[PDB]
Amino acid sequence: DEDETTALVCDNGSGLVKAGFAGDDAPRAVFPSIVGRPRHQGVMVGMGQKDSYVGDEAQSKRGILTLKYPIEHGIITNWDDMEKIWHHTFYNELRVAPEEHPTLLTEAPLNPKANREKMTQIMFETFNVPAMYVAIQAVLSLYASGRTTGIVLDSGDGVTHNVPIYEGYALPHAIMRLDLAGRDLTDYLMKILTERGYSFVTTAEREIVRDIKEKLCYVALDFENEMATAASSSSLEKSYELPDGQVITIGNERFRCPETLFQPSFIGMESAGIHETTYNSIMKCDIDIRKDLYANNVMSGGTTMYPGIADRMQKEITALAPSTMKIKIIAPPERKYSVWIGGSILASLSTFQQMWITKQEYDEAGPSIVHRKCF
Amino acid sequence: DEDETTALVCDNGSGLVKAGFAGDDAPRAVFPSIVGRPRHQGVMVGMGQKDSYVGDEAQSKRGILTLKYPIEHGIITNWDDMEKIWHHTFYNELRVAPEEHPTLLTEAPLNPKANREKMTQIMFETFNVPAMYVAIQAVLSLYASGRTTGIVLDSGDGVTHNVPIYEGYALPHAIMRLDLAGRDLTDYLMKILTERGYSFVTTAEREIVRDIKEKLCYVALDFENEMATAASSSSLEKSYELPDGQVITIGNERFRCPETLFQPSFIGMESAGIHETTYNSIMKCDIDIRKDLYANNVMSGGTTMYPGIADRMQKEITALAPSTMKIKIIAPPERKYSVWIGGSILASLSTFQQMWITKQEYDEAGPSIVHRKCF
Amino acid sequence: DEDETTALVCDNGSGLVKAGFAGDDAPRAVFPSIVGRPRHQGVMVGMGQKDSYVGDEAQSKRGILTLKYPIEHGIITNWDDMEKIWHHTFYNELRVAPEEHPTLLTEAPLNPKANREKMTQIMFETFNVPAMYVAIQAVLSLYASGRTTGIVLDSGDGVTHNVPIYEGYALPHAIMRLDLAGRDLTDYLMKILTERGYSFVTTAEREIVRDIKEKLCYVALDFENEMATAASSSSLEKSYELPDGQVITIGNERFRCPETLFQPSFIGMESAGIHETTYNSIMKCDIDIRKDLYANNVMSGGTTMYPGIADRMQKEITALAPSTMKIKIIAPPERKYSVWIGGSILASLSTFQQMWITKQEYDEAGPSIVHRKCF
């Protein structure tokens, strides 16, 4: 803010990319993370007002774009289209030069070592940004929620991580990476459909599977109790019309898919569901740490959107843990965008200075600097 | 035969249609799959001893036939001419009534739902065939080979499939379709030729492009290594004169087209060439299958017809995959007809009892019978 | 041999399972202790030649298997895969029926009540074995060493125990269990590396850390003196190249990791190291027993494998313990396998018969039989 280190905020999420100024309630420019290259070349018949297709203009008219995804799962296949993406982001809708103001970015949990310096290198050395920082996705949520201690589960849509939080910042040991997330459930559902006879192999119908799950699917109170229920037909089979060709009936699979977070055995993971993994991180921390960790439990992300994810967690948690303190699960009305919300709040507040990384700080210790200050 | 279920084998594919009886090791009748109706027409002036033009007599004449192609990419646009095609197939060269003997047919991979029942309807209802079955094209090839292990890459000519095989039938989950195939190369060569200065837009010269490619074209050991070699004009440019009235000099382009099978970037595909696609299919189908798959990889169809196809695969495969097992490429002397050869053996053998569909099984499970029995 | 006992010897160890006949110099059949199920489902394409993957054949494929470990901390998570493991052990390489001959098994110290009987139940009632015994791991090592009294430290890999031994057998009261061991050191090394800038979160690099530690690591003599030495780069930093693409420099950390064995303070636990706990076990024991205990000290297991481990013990032990008697540390040329090289002597020998537990005795006494004959 006016030759101040503050930080303009860009969230690099799987669905859309949100960017804007520090100290502002909502993002300015929003577009899909895709960059166009030719798909059926033939040669250039003519070019539609630009060399490469990037952002909102590209998605609306589709076609030429190969639907190349620079960012997914937190990992980037090709850096070259990225330079164009930030160009569209700052110059076209923000209407401000990146050189003039500070930049804040969101850090996907357990991201590769190469990416932090590479992302930073483009903005400082290439475009001369006065300062910039990449924020920890899990840490931001805790301050936004208004709690100073606990355990936070936070997934943007790409990956899911369990990060315990203490008065001091958490370090690698306790934190674990989980492969179960909301996008995963959409992919998982197609796999189960195979036994009756329904298949959606191509990306054209990929969107449809996602649509089916959020409007009609729900989370079973207990999978073991309701399995017996599936023999009869009433609640499990519901008539639904898909606009394109045929009727689809889904019963047991509607709840079988959501059941994945609590029952990983069907999908194929060694680790137990989300409630079991929560116990592991809390247990190995320092002994005075535990009493206020249990009081605050935070559930967030796309996979917690279902009709009652929060209710299941309380029964199970109290059985294998100490009974000397309150157990409560906190789930905000809009936990899915809790990731984005924390980042905007950080920009607004000046408490954020201890947390961030300076350009000079990167070469004092080298490429290992991101690990040194954050997880 | 006479009443035993056995089989009559008729193969509908991208080149020619082969028909015969089970227990027989060679085809009885072969003709191109084309049916003719008037072209310029002018109403009618008489009949050329054939109401509709079908089979071997038709192709030699050319001229009158519309060159209507009943089968494209595994999909048939018009079924009315189909009835005539089988009429020529069984009644003339075979000299046996379809009504009298059971029929075995070949299934084009990832074929549309409408076609299985439609094909079945023509035989059992219209012509009263005692029994029939449709067999999956990738599965048949492995038995002719005699191998009980190995991966089969097979293309009729129209399409390319990377279906996994383990002495059984594989589900839709592990099978991929590729838009890159042997007929494709013939079409591709005209497309690339446009930058150089040659055009073959009309259908009259469509046949000619194929002829150029098979006799003189070859597959470069490494495209990256020989690009430099292009400047020297000795091996690359050969003087060939086309029978009609033009001279065509082809150099870099002769191997540039073959190069397409291993380097899709010039054509315009997001996926990597056939060797990479093989890795994609191998990772997903089953890990334990891999040790025996690399040793026994099989290349078949029009695509692998060009000399030197087997050697390139050996160098490329070891770079992105495990190095704990033997690497060899197996291409039989007549891999182009490998699809048909395997099918005859299944008809001949009594093992196929578990694997086939009877005349009233279709009625018992309804239109959904094909899906119930096979993927 | 067939008529009476003699007894087969099977050691259920940390990395390999050894089985064989009595009176034998070495074990007959050895394989890794792992059982596989499908890792990523996608049901089955063909079959990997077995319903379940067990032993040496299973390890070679290593991909499709779930890497489920039947033995951890001397505790078995799932009994069902165990039945298959013994099936491979006796029928495949021994080429003798378990039913025909008696079985001897190694007992992990301070093991759960359920396990002795459960292990016994499978072999007797399920397979009708004539006789089966489980031996005390700490007791066997002492006889192999040829010493009748002393303090024995023995760790296979999973756990570390300090059990003092007198002319008569020891009982729970004067024995201790430690969670710090040789496999722990492999895990421990990753935790320290965080300060320098190296992190290996995944299991793929887990194996690599183990490789680093045994070839170059050593155990520092008096840690407090050596910290000043840390400034000098001649001994602490060595250049070593990792096969997968990274450079690893280990200095202070190479000796600091082994240090944890003697200095628990760095990790954050209030549990004392091996030399302090040695004092604890001896103090508990009767007053006229200590003088012969101090003269002979036995060190064994993975922990004592590193060069220079024996010398440190002499200096440290006398500091907090009495100085009125000779202090000597005895380490055999091979102590890692000392666990296994104990059971063989008291298996081959006829004397061992009085010590063991047999079929009828288990039923006659009941669930209390393990306690009745052993501490």
The C-alpha atoms of residue C43 and residue B170 are separated, in whole angstroms, by 10
Q: Tell me the two tokens of residue A89.
A: 């982001």
Same domain, A62 and A91: no
Residue pair B165/B153 in contact (Cβ under 8 Å)? The answer is: no
Residue pair C115/C76 in contact (Cβ under 8 Å)? The answer is: yes
Same domain, B124 and B82: yes
Q: Tokens 């006799």 sit at which residue?
A: B215
Same domain, C68 and C82: no
β partners of residue B136: B107
Phi, psi of B364, rounded to the nearest 5 degrees: -60, -40
β partners of residue B19: B10, B29
**Closest to C294 measured CA to CA, from C276, C278, C273:** C278
Q: Is C257 helix (H, G, I), strand (E, B) or coil?
A: helix
Categorise residue B206: left if φ over 0, alpha if ψ from -120 to 50, beta otherwise. alpha
Q: Tell me the two tokens of residue C84.
A: 């298959």
Residue pair C32/C16 in contact (Cβ under 8 Å)? The answer is: yes
Q: Tell me the two tokens of residue B353.
A: 């009892």
Q: How far is CA B107 from CA B22, B119, B374, B375, in A?
A: 17, 11, 11, 11
The C-alpha atoms of residue A11 and residue A28 are separated, in whole angstroms, by 12
Query: Positive or negative CA dihedral for A169, A175, A179, A184?
Result: negative
CA triple C297-C298-C304, angle to 5 deg: 120
Q: What is the SS3 string spanning B150-176? A: CCEEEECCCCEECCCCCCCCCCHHHCC
Select from B248, B274, B300 the last residue of a domain: B274
The C-alpha atoms of residue C157 and residue C108 are separated, in whole angstroms, by 11
Contact C45 B170 (CB under 8 A): yes
**Closest to C185 measured CA to CA, from C301, C319, C284, C103:** C301
Q: How far is CA B251 from CA B227, B239, B246, B257, C72, in A?
A: 11, 10, 17, 11, 66
Q: Which of residues 44-63 of C touch B (CB under 8 A)?
A: 44-48, 60-61, 63
DSSP, res A169: P
Neighbours of chain C (3+ CB pairs under 8 A): A, B
Phi, psi of B53, rounded to the nearest 5 degrees: -95, 115
Residue pair B309/B153 in contact (Cβ under 8 Å)? The answer is: no
Question: Would you give the distance in Å from CA B182 to the centre of its chain?
Answer: 9
Q: Does B171 touch chain A (CB under 8 A)?
A: yes
Same domain, C39 and C106: no
Please give the single-letter amino acid code of residue C239.
Answer: S
Mutate to test the interface with C, among B139, B279, B286, B289 (most CBs of C within 10 A): B286
Same domain, A87 and A225: no
The C-alpha atoms of residue C182 and residue B233 are separated, in whole angstroms, by 68
Give me the residue from A173, A268, A286 closest to C191, CB to CB: A173
Domain with A145 in it = 139-185+275-337
The C-alpha atoms of residue C258 and residue C261 are separated, in whole angstroms, by 6
Q: What is the DSSP string of B170-217?
A: PPGGG--EES--HHHHHHHHHHHHHHHT----SGGGHHHHHHHHHHH-
Categorise residue C268: left if φ over 0, alpha if ψ from -120 to 50, beta otherwise. left
**Closest to C282 measured CA to CA, from C271, C293, C297, C272:** C293
Please give the single-letter amino acid code of residue B128.
Answer: N
Domain of B118, CATH number, reads 3.30.420.40
Select from C72, C100, C130 the last residue of a domain: C72
Same domain, A361 and A240: no
The C-alpha atoms of residue A9 and residue A90 are separated, in whole angstroms, by 11
Give how many domains chain C has, as a whole number: 4
Contact A191 B173 (CB under 8 A): yes
For the purposes of burial, counting CB atoms within 10 Å of the CB of B101, is it exposed (0-12), middle (13-18) or buried (19 or more)? buried
Domain of B63, CATH number, reads 2.30.36.70
Q: Tell me the two tokens of residue A12.
A: 């690099």
Question: Would you give the distance in Å from CA C176 to the centre of its chain?
Answer: 15
Same domain, C259 and C205: yes
Q: After which residues is chain B broken (C to N over 2.5 A)?
A: none
Same domain, A303 and A154: yes
End-to-end CA distance of chain C: 30
Select from C72, C103, C122 the last residue of a domain: C72
Q: Using the CB atoms, write b or e for A14-53: b if 16+ within 10 Å.
A: bebbbbbbbbeeebbbbbbbbbbbeeeeeeeeeeeeeebb
Residue pair B248/B211 in contact (Cβ under 8 Å)? The answer is: no
Please give the helix or strand (H or E) that residue C190 lies within, else none.
helix C182-196
Same domain, A301 and A159: yes
CA triple A220-A225-A228, angle to 5 deg: 105
Contact C44 B164 (CB under 8 A): no
Same domain, A65 and A134: no
Please give the helix or strand (H or E) that residue C299 lies within, else none.
strand C297-299
Q: Tell me the two tokens of residue A28.
A: 């300015």
Residue pair A249/C19 in contact (Cβ under 8 Å)? The answer is: no
Contact B286 C45 (CB under 8 A): yes
C-alpha count within 13 angstroms, C-beta hemisphere, residue B354: 3
As a dihedral over the C-alpha atoms of residue B258, residue B260, residue B263, residue B264, rounded to 10 degrees, the angle is -170
Query: Positive or negative CA dihedral for A47, A52, A58, A63?
Result: positive
Strands of the sheet with A16-20, listed across from one edge: A29-32, A16-20, A8-12, A103-107, A132-136
Q: Tell me the two tokens of residue B190.
A: 């005209």
**Closest to C317 measured CA to CA, from C187, C168, C153, C167:** C153
Contact A201 B172 (CB under 8 A): yes
Same domain, B82 and B181: no
Give me the residue from B173, B195, B268 closest to A194, CB to CB: B173
**Closest to C245 measured CA to CA, from C204, C285, C284:** C204
**Closest to B35 measured CA to CA, from B74, B106, B111, B86:** B86
Beta carbon pairs, A and B, within 8 Å: 20
Name the pairing type of β-strands B16-21 and B29-32.
Answer: antiparallel
Q: Tokens 């066997």 sit at which residue?
A: C140
Query: Positive or negative CA dihedral for A16, A17, A22, A28?
Result: negative
**Closest to A306 measured CA to CA, from A329, A269, A336:** A336
CA triple B32-B33-B39, angle to 5 deg: 100
Phi, psi of A147, rounded to the nearest 5 degrees: -120, 140
The C-alpha atoms of residue A64 and residue A70 are separated, in whole angstroms, by 16
Residue pair C199/C190 in contact (Cβ under 8 Å)? The answer is: yes
CA triple A117-A118-A121, angle to 5 deg: 80
Taking every pair of Cα atoms in chain B, the longest distance, rounded to a whole number of angstroms, is: 71
Q: Does C41 touch chain A (CB under 8 A)?
A: yes
Q: What is the SS3 string spanning B326-346? A: CCCEECCCCCCCHHHHHHHHH
DSSP, res B321: S
Q: Tell me the two tokens of residue B131.
A: 């029994």
Q: Tokens 């490494």 sit at which residue?
A: B222
3-state percent helix, strand, coil for chain C, nearest multiple of 5 = 40, 15, 45
For the purposes of burial, counting CB atoms within 10 Å of the CB of C49, is it exposed (0-12), middle (13-18) or buried (19 or more)? exposed
DSSP, res A245: S
Domain of B232, CATH number, reads 3.90.640.10
**Closest to A184 measured CA to CA, from A301, A300, A331, A34:** A301
Same domain, C21 and C106: yes
Q: Does B288 touch chain C (CB under 8 A)?
A: yes
Give me the residue from C42, C43, C64 closest to B288, CB to CB: C64
